[PDB]
Each structure stands twice: as structure tokens, then as C-alpha cells.
């Protein structure tokens, strides 16, 4: 009752390390079968010289899959290759494999031989026990279920040549019945000992020329080949990527035949095909292509093709295209179904049917090839539309047939959010893997679904993949950044600065993000009744607006609240919060003890009470003196205000004490930074009378307060008063004490741990130099906005990107509108982009480890 | 949506050639594991000396399964044994295998090793191609599907130790979904090369003592064993025999474990058990026995038993019985599930739980064994009632569990038809097989369901099983009769005699049969209005009744019609019909051109017209003269009447011509048999006037006649008049010509073919001596009734029995009321009663055909 789709694909086929190399060789018309001594001699025992073999067989990333190096040498090579391509298939689906770690997904593998098992057990005096664990035929599925933590059925089955498609049929029935949510289908074949080829030669099944002349007059046998293929099957609701939908799948057996056990029977195959499409409810006119078994034998090809033309070409009125990938590749026996399925799905993805090789004249015993009812694809011709049938028949008599419907999702309509720059994060075992992923993301910068699945597969722990990277796409600067991430957990800390950081155009560039704009409009409707709206303070800003201190207060708190909201939808939960005056006001929303409206009205009421009453113009000169030397060198009535660092302390007072330290700024090395904000002496004794009018207004907004958390480190309260009744809750008296007390921004900074990642929440990171000398040198400081930046959205996205390079997982897909659930076809492949650590070589059995009759 | 039942069982286990030998060894407490050099040496390579092995491995009936003797030598022995036990399982179900020849039944076999394949391919210069066909792992299922002509899925699967029960689980899902009507589940394991045992020894899994000390403190490993088991699964409506009903079946996998791939996890097993019974809807209180995996390892037994006591023994209030057949037998790896299932089903059939061996003290790490919540069966204790759970866990991590409910059908209530004698037919390859079946049927003569399934499995062609036999059970004579049947088809011919064969008590003994009594009452209601009823002519017969000729006529035709009805429900369709006067009247009902009422009224009207008019008393003297000499030696007005043979001709005439040939009977060798029937000259010139009154009455009964068939050979019409208008239909003029013409019973007999089987339909076979000298000597004449026989039902059943020995298939189950569809439990097993032609020895690989490190 559930729809079953094909979600992922990966493979290793002759002269085809990756699935793309496979496709290229297939459409290139290259003879992937070769005459090389890569496994045994050229023509020993009278064997054919030509065979299809894999490029390499001794490469395995043993540390990733957690196998001991002594156990990896005594493993079946086909199991090592199956582990790697099984990871690559899940990643090709767009699914992180960690989301299937407890589920009931099953594994079905089609194998037919275990030659490594009998090569590794020839000497009973030097045996090891690990050869049983790494080479037994059930372990080809059980090791996959063990590593990927799969709780479903784990079966290895052998059904001769139809073994791989039979596994697909059983996995189909498991998903269809609701037993399993997902499944993995595999198929493996490796040619190691020549005695099996001598057996097939004496049976009469091997061509002397080593060629599958499919549907040809000169066909006299097949050519043996290798291959390791895996696909990922899932229900429709879990699929990020869809290649095709399996309409139906079934099987039968020939039964008794007078001719023999080996001989094919086309009547039972015709019955299987007709019963399948009937039960599926599809008309035979709707087909356009059928991938035949097509092994090239003398008696098998007319039986199969006459069965096809009886079941399908009765009342059709159109030619039916037919092909066979064994003419391009050779015939891997238990892995022939998934290799043909890979060719079909690659042909559907690229829009062109891959041609057949070695087809010159039709077989005269097949009359449908002579009048045009069946047409062999011998040239590349485009895909028009309809269903594709795939059948594979074993020589024992097992018949399997699949009907699948390709997906035809068009590329989406253009949208105004598609012009915004995006983030792309990557991970890998080596720097080259991260470079490959980032450069392929740069090549396809306008493909939104491709970037979404690439961002989805990047959340791997640093112990598994120790190299991470990022690149900002769609911007003007660009540039991949790759570095090695240290292992372990690093705490994330939030620091939000105070006043003096406003400018012309605060956060406009990232007003294009929807969630930031929603937060800004929420703060707008909150201050709307109070004769104010921060939207004109954002868009219609000139120099007559931010010299006011009320507008500066609300335009600081709203921007910090919007940044915290963006970080909260990002998935990030802070471990420690420490602010600075109005930053400490926004720390209430950062901690959750405040909400939007109370924070914005508290900031506006602070500004309103300050602008209501009037006190002598104040100063904020900054001097190059410590905290203790400033108390003894100020005149009476002049108080130190800000304890930023051990060398930077801000003084507060009137103009004549400000003019007093102009002369002492000439003396020695003393800073003469006299930056003021409206000429008002915040954090001073001049506002001891400001609090009682202000406190009255506040009690009407932050009534029934909530207690502060242990993560919030207070900066207006000294350390010995942290347990008092005033500093447990974020009440109205807590906020008015912030204005009348000096900010202690040094003793809060020494409680930050050793390897913390510090995020600065400010419209301009002017506290970055203070935090560098004020914190431990094993900390990372990341700014989020920069004053007078042309595209501040690119600056924000680079901060999120280097947050990925520190070790904190943060998915930038949540910032943008989500992509529709089926990806459109023609989306680029992901499984060729995965690279492993292949610096080591492992043991492979040779031809001398098998009995030669000596 | 369909109920799945276990219908058949067969097996070959250590020291257990048949399933009964297995049961005996199991309850006998015999250690089926031995220390003999039956496969390799005693303790070479440091291997344990003890192992469980089959009794013989080189026996195969190659001609029955149609394999060439050169192909049989290069076959896997385990496939040969699987073919034989697969036939035995179907026969044990009570089902003829020919009724599944076109159906969609599937085959699932659990294998794990193919050592014969690598022993037969060691020399690439002397290879043969047949070793691929007979030893490839897919062929273990494909050869079964090929021989038995099965169209369903044919899969060989390997899932380590749980491989046999996994096949049962998949076959369960196929029947449950409605995909398959029936299925065959197999499991095979054979120990041939010692290198695999050395691998298991180095892994640490083998006990040094070669003992499975299940649930014991001293358990340190398992003992390797052999075994070939097959069961037959079917839907409920097809089952003649039910062992149990599968309530539920399922599987899962352990997934990732910190301890390793090999280590068992009881938590996932507990989850599987709890999910199964929940989905099945059965309470955990309803269980009474669970067959554990019970391999005897140090860390596996506490994990499995603690998982069982968490899933099952939470709120139970009763002890739960637990056992393990591996303590009796050893551990066959991929065939452990079906062997345990065989032990459980044998224990349910015999009413006693088979005890465990080698259990002395409980494992201290299992606290449920120390307080009584789990109880080990170490003594034979009776079966009380409830469900039985069977689980088998592979060492790769595959977990499978079965819930099955035993059938508790009581033996039926006694009935009056159970005292009647029955027929039992048998077939076999040898005379000893037929003798075994007949003597086991004699031992259980009162078991009706057992005899019904034995009669059902006996319909095999003579080319397959050339020895047939029969025995009449419940009679007083008895005696098995065994002979060799000649091959080919033999035509069946019906001959029904005329008058002069009546006696006192015609057919009474077989009035107890229901269909004969129904035919008699149908003829009774037909003649009821005509002031007659043949029931008092049957029961209330004395010597004042059958001296009348009307009663003799109806009591001949009714008995012959009832015999023909019994033969028609028997399944038999005649090839040639030839009668004799009133026999030729009953030939109309034999041919189908007449019905019951027309035949009975025609016979009664012949008698009524004969008894109406009166003619001079006639004679039927019989003389020892030929047909031509009788015409020249009779006086004028005296006509020869019956041409029985070349030496026997009946004369017809008055008393004074009858007295004339008394004197000539003294002369030479002339018979003086003057037997008359009422003193009336039938087949003579004295009844030329009898026909016109008779014809008038007949036109009112056999109005609108039907044409005679080519099988009916006329005896009142000469050969040259066979195409005339009088002899094409069985009209009223056809019957009145029978009375006025001589019967030509010789020229009809020369048209009978060479090897015909002749059946005599008469209440007393007085024509048996005539047919012996009148027919060819290659014909068999079978009488059906004998005059003055004490039990004529035993005489009829012996005729049907020797009809089976001729070659004609005839099932005597149709004569009696049918047996209810589920057979009651305790019905004797059938699969130990099948014997083969095992006079030849085939090749088995030795230990020297494997690499020893030389």
C-alpha cells in the first residue's frame, strides 16, 4: 500500500570506478572488456583472452569502517568494495546515514561465489579465525547491517544470474507491505580463480571471442565480467531524490522442460511479463524501452525476444526499443540486474538512450527484428516518454521482471530568493575530498536542490571525517576554505555588545532573509502603538535619525533579536551568555527569560526616560590605564565606567574632566579616544535620579519576572553578589541597576573555558579587538556584521561557514525557503564526488592460491 | 489473509535415517554424536573427536529422478538426499505430487556451504561441465523446482545458523499474502572438509569435548552436525494432514554492537519475541514450551535465556518449559531450525516432550533457572496444552522466531460404516516397498484417515513405480498380493451376462454400501407404481420368488445397474462394451444411451409380455458341437440359440427334441447340460408372435431414442448389418429383435484387443470359463460377484484390488463416506514407509580431495 522509489545509486563496474565513468564508457561505445593479464594469464587452459574486470581491487578505507588492519587483509575484496559503494549510495540519495541508525531497514545482497574463502582456508596449519568472519557468504549482508546499524532482515541469496534483481524484488515487497521503511540492494561478482571459467567453458556457455553479440546472427556465448553495485530503496515520503518509481515486480520459475535444465523457455517468461503489467494496471502501449537479458547465446536470444514480442508487441502500432548492457560491458552473473538498472537510470537522467555494441545483422529466427516491431538501439537517440521493463533470467530457470516509471519533474520556476547568495559546507576524509565537493558545488551554483542535499550530507562528526570546508556561492568574492578540525566538543558562547556600534543602514543587506524580516516586523508591531516604527529607521535612514538615542536603542535591540532568531532557527543552542549594557538587555531574550515585546519596550523606555530628563553633557574618553590606577587618578565626582580589558578603561564625566585628561594623553602612551554617544554619561553617578522615574514605567512591562539561568553571566553585578535576590531574576530592578552601575566586562571573561567558540552578536563588531586580548588564546572569535559592508549577507554567511570549520554543526538550509520534496531530474550525481583515504594496499588472492591439478 | 499450516515432514538426521528413528533416538536419550573416522581422522589438526554425522551418504535413486548415471556421480550428495526427502515430505502430507505439477508453489532452501563444488573443480584439465549444474548453490532449489515442475519462486539463501528458519519465514509470507498456494522449505548441512572445522576451532566456537551442554554451567561451545530436513507448507484448504498452524513469523537483526560482530544481544531478541506475539494477538500466558537456540556457549545462553524471561516470564504465574535439540543431536549450522521444528512436531504427535541431555546444574548467570520461572525438560513429561515458540539466531546477528499452535483434533466417533472391510492399494520401486506399505496398513487397519491418505498417494504410473500391490483389510481372509505391472496402457472392457445367474440373496452383502443401496432404491421407486418393489426380492427372498421370471429380470437389471454405478463413481470409463441378451439390455445404461427407469421398465416389460402369453415349454440343452455342425444335426423347427464359444452351443426347442439329444449325449464326448430357466425357449422361433404385443408396450418408454456408440459391440446383429438403420440407435425395435434372434457371442469377442482387461458385471460369474477359452490368452478376466459367498463385499473389493495390479487406476476411497478434512493427531507417519531402489553407490568426496597445505 506504499509507493516504492529508487533513491540512491552507486557502483564500481569495468573501467568504471565511478557511476559517471560507467555512463561515459557506455555512451562512448568503448569496449569495457579487455585482454590483459590482470587476474590470470592471457589464454591458459584454453580460456578466452577477453574479460571485463575492475580497475582496482586492493583499496579500502579500513579506519572509517572500523576494521582492524589484520582483519582487513583477510577480508573478501568484494565485501570491502560493497561497504564503500553502500555508503556512497546512501549519500547519493541525499540522506545522512545517521538518520537510519535505529530503523528497521533491510539488506538483500545477491552473491554467487566465494573464492576468497577457499583461498584463505587452504592451509590448516596457518589458519586464522577472522577469515570466517570476513569471507562467509552471509557476512556480505551481515557486516553491512552491523556497520550501518540496521535492524531489518539481512539476507544473502543466490539465484544464479538473476540474483541481483531477485534481491530488488524482495526489497520491493518488504517496503510495499509496510514491513520496512527503507532497504539496500546489492550485487557483487569478482573473477579470481580460472577453474570456474573452465567449468563455464566446458558447459558451452562462453563465447570463444569473449563478446556478447546481443541480438546478432554471430552470437555464440557471453563474456564473464565483474561488478559491485548498490541501490537504495525507500518509501515515497522519505525520498529526497527520486530516479524512478517501481510500479510492479515479480518472479516465477520455468519448471519442467523436456530440453534440459539449462535451456531457456520463453513461454513462462511471456506469462510473467503479461501477469505483471496486468496486476500493475498499465497498458502495453505505454512502454517505450525494455532492457532484455540479452546474453548473446544461440538459443536464448530468439526465445526471449519471441516471448517479448508475444507479450508486448501484439497490438502496439509503434516500434518498441530494446537494448542490452552486456554488449557494452560483458556479463557479471549475479550482478547483471543492478548493472542494467544502473545503465537505464543513467540513460533516463541524461535524456539519451545508450547504444548497443557489436550489432550488425539481425538474428533470422526473430521475425520481430525484421519487420520493425522491435528496434535495437544502436545509435544515441533521445528519451521520449513511457515505461521501461527490466528482466533478468538465471540459467537454473529463475525469471524476474521489473516495471518502473521514470520521474519527469521539471526544473522549478525562478523566484526572487534564488538570486541571494547561499552557503555550502562539506566534509571528507582528505583535503582533496572537500576540494572536490566544493569545486563541484561551485560548478553548479544555481542548482538549489543539489546544494540542499550537499548541505544535508555534511553533518558528520570530526572523528569520522577530520577535514571540513565551506564556500559562499553566488557572491562576488568566493574562495573555498579548507582546514582540519580538532576532535572533541567545543562550547559555544554568545557575546552581544552595547551602544556606539550603529551606522547608516543597519542590517538592510540581510533584510532579504525572510525570518529576519519577520522578526523586524514583529518588533515593529510591538513599538507601532508607541508612535514608532523601526522600518523607516532601517530603510529611510539619514544622519538626522541615529544621532537620536531612542532610535539607536530600538535599532540595536531589534537587530540583535533578529540575529538571535536567525541563530535559533539555525539549530544552535548557546552554552554561555555574557553581554554589555544593552547587550545584557538582549541577553534576556538570548536566555529565554525575556520575550520580544518586553525587550523592545524596555530598550525604548530606557531611551525615553533618558531623553525625558536632562543632565550635564557627559563624556566617554578611553584611557590606557588599568582598573586600579583609574580610581586614584580621577578627580572626585568622576567614576570609571567600563572595564573592557586590563589596559582599556572608559572614564565618565563632564567636559572639564574630559578636557583634563587631554593633557595627560600627551604624557607617555595614553589613548585619547574620546568617542561619545550623544554626550551623555552612562554608567555614572549622574543617573542616580534617572532610575526612580524609569523603574515606575518598567514595572508595567516585565511584571512577574522569570529567573535567570546559570549560563547567563552577569556583567552589572559583582561576583560575590551573584547569589543575591537581585541577580536571580531578570526583573525591573535588574535593568535599572544596569544603568547606574559600571560594566564589569573582565571578570566575566575569565570564566570562559579554554576551547570556546565565541560569537559576536552586533551590527558592527567593534569589540573584536577587546575580546582577542581579553580571552584565552585557544578561543575563536567570529564576527557576524561589519560596518559599511556592501553585502552584509555574505559576511553573515561566511561567519556560519567558519562556525562549521570550528566543529559546531549548523545547517544553513534553514535560513532559506525549503526546496520541494522530489528533486527535478537532471540534478547532478553525488556518489562520484565521494573520495576516500586509499593510501594503503590490502591483500588480494592470486591465481597461484588455487588448485591447478598438481 | 490465509491460514498457513504445516502439512508434511521428512528428514535424515544423525543415526536417524527416517523421522521415526530420529524421534526414537531423541526420546531414547542416545548421544547421536559419535567418535568415528566416518569423514576424516579422529583428532587431526587438533579437532574435537566427536561429531554428529549421517548414516549413509552415497545412496540415490537416480532413475526415478531422471538423472544420467554420469551426472549422478558429479552431483552434491546433499542435493541427492534433498530430492529424496522432498518427495517423502509431499507423500507424508497425504498429497500426490502430481497434483502440484503446474501450480505456483515455491521452494526456499537454507544452505551455507558447497564443498563438493570446490572438490570437483580442483583439476582444470579433467573437469566436466556437469559439476556446475549439480553443485552450484542455486541449483539446490532449482533442481527441485525442475523435477517437481514448480512455477513459484526458487531461492537458495544463506543467513548463517538461522538459514533454515528464515526460509520457513519467507515461505510463510508467500502463503499468507496469497502469492503461493504451497511451499517447500529445506535445510541441508554436510561435513566434508576439516578446514572449516579448523576455522571454527580458531574462532573459539567449538567445544573441546564435542558436546552442546545447553543451559549448563560447563558449557563451552557446540558440536558440529549434519542433517537434511524438508517440510511442506500449504494453505488450510489444501491440507489433508495438519501438524500445527503457524500463528506468526518474523525476523530482525542486532545492528551495531560495541562487543563485536559475533557477540549475541538478548535485547533485540526480546524485542522480536514481544513484537511477534503482540502482532499475532496471543497472550504470553498461553505458551507452554519454547525451543531455545541453546547452542551451549558461555555468553550466548545467559543472553538468550534472560531475553526470554524478560519477554515472556514477567506476569505468568506458571513455569515455562524450555529445551534444546542440540544437546541430543549437535548443531547443524544452516539446518538447525527445521531439525528443532521436527523434534517439536514429533513431540506433539506422540504426546510427550523429549528430554534434554547433559544438563546437571544450572548456569548461575541465569536467575530464572534458579527460582522456577524456567524449567528444563530433563525427563519425559506429557504435553498439557498451549503454544510453542521456536527461535534460531545466526552468529552474524540474524534473529528469527516462530509461533505455532498445535492441532488437537480428537479421533472420530464410531460409525456403522467403520466395521465394513476396506481396500488398500500400494505402489513402490521394489517389492519390499510395497510389502512395507501393506504390512503397515495391516497394523493400523482401524485408522480410516491413514488408509485414505495411503490410498491417495498410490496413483503413480507404472513407468515410475513398477511394483503394485493390494490387501483387503477388515475381512477374514486377508493376504497381501504383490506383482510387477507391465508398462503401457491396457483397454478396459465391460461384459455383462444374461439370465440363469440368479440365486438366493442377490447382492445383499454389498447392500451395506451407500451408493449401491441408493441405486437399488432408485430402481425400486421406478418399479414401485408397477405393483413391484425389488427390496423384498432382495431381503425377503425364498425359493418361491426367483422361479418367477419377472422378478429374475428386474433383479438382474437392478444389480447390474448398481454395479455399473459403483464402477462409475470409482472413476472408471469403459473402452468397449459387449453384452449377452439382458446383459445387452444393461449395456444401454453402460453406454449412456439409456437411463435407469427405461432399462428397468424394459426388463420388466419383457418379463411381463413373456409371462402374459403362453407357448410350449422350451429347452436350453447345451451340446459339445460347433456352430456349423449344429445347423445340420438339429431337426427342423429346432434352432441353435447361443454361440458362446467354438465348442459350446446352446440348442432351443421343446421337450421331445430335448429328449432326442439325450441319447446323442451318450455318444462320444457330448455335454448333456440341460439347464433351463422356467422352461421357456428364448432366442427361438416360438416368440415371433411375442414381439408385436411387446413392441406396443415398449414404444411408450424408450420413445425418442439415442444413438449407440462405437464402443458398444452388438451381439444380436450380425457384422455386415452393423451400419444399418436398425443397429445405430437403441430403440424399441432394437430390444425386441434381441429376443427373436440368436445371440452371437463369438464374433464380438474376436474384436477385443490383445492386452485388454475384462470386467464381468454379473451377480454370479458363470461366463468366466467361456471367456477364458473364447478370448486371447493375453487378457485378464476379473469377476465381481460369486454365488453363495458369505461376504460378497470382500469379493468385490478383491476385484478392484487386482484391477489396480493390472494397471488401471481406481481409487477405492470413493466407495465409502469421505473422511473429515483435518486428520486427527496421532495418525501414523507416512514418510518412514517410503523405500527406494538403493542398490547402487555413487561418488562422495573424501578428505584427500581438499588442500592440506602441501
Numbering used by the authors:
A (entry chain B), B (entry chain A): 1 to 854
What is the paper's account of this structure, in its own sentences?
In mammals, fatty acid synthase (FASN) contains multiple enzymatic domains to catalyse all chemical reactions needed for de novo fatty acid synthesis. An ACP carries substrates from one enzyme to another, sequentially following the chemical reactions. In metazoans, all essential enzymes are included in a single polypeptide chain and are arranged into two main functional domains, each carrying out a key chemical process and named correspondingly the condensing and modifying domains. The entire cycle of fatty acid synthesis requires that ACP carries the substrate from one enzyme to another repeatedly. Here, using a strategy of tagging and purifying endogenous FASN in HEK293T cells for single-particle cryo-electron microscopy studies, we characterized the structural dynamics of endogenous human FASN.
For each dataset, three-dimensional (3D) classifications isolate a subset, from which 3D reconstruction shows a fuzzy density associated with the KS domain. Focusing on these subsets, we refined the condensing and modifying wings separately to high resolutions with the best to 2.5 Å and 2.7 Å, respectively, from the 1,3-DBP sample. From these two separate reconstructions, we generated a composite map of human FASN incubated with 1,3-DBP, in which an ACP is seen bound to the KS domain. This composite map is of sufficient quality for accurate modelling of most of the modifying and condensing wings. In all of these groups, the catalytic cavities of KS and MAT are well resolved. Notably, we observed that small molecules, orlistat or 1,3-DBP, do not alter the overall shapes of the conformational landscapes but generate a few hotspots within the central region.
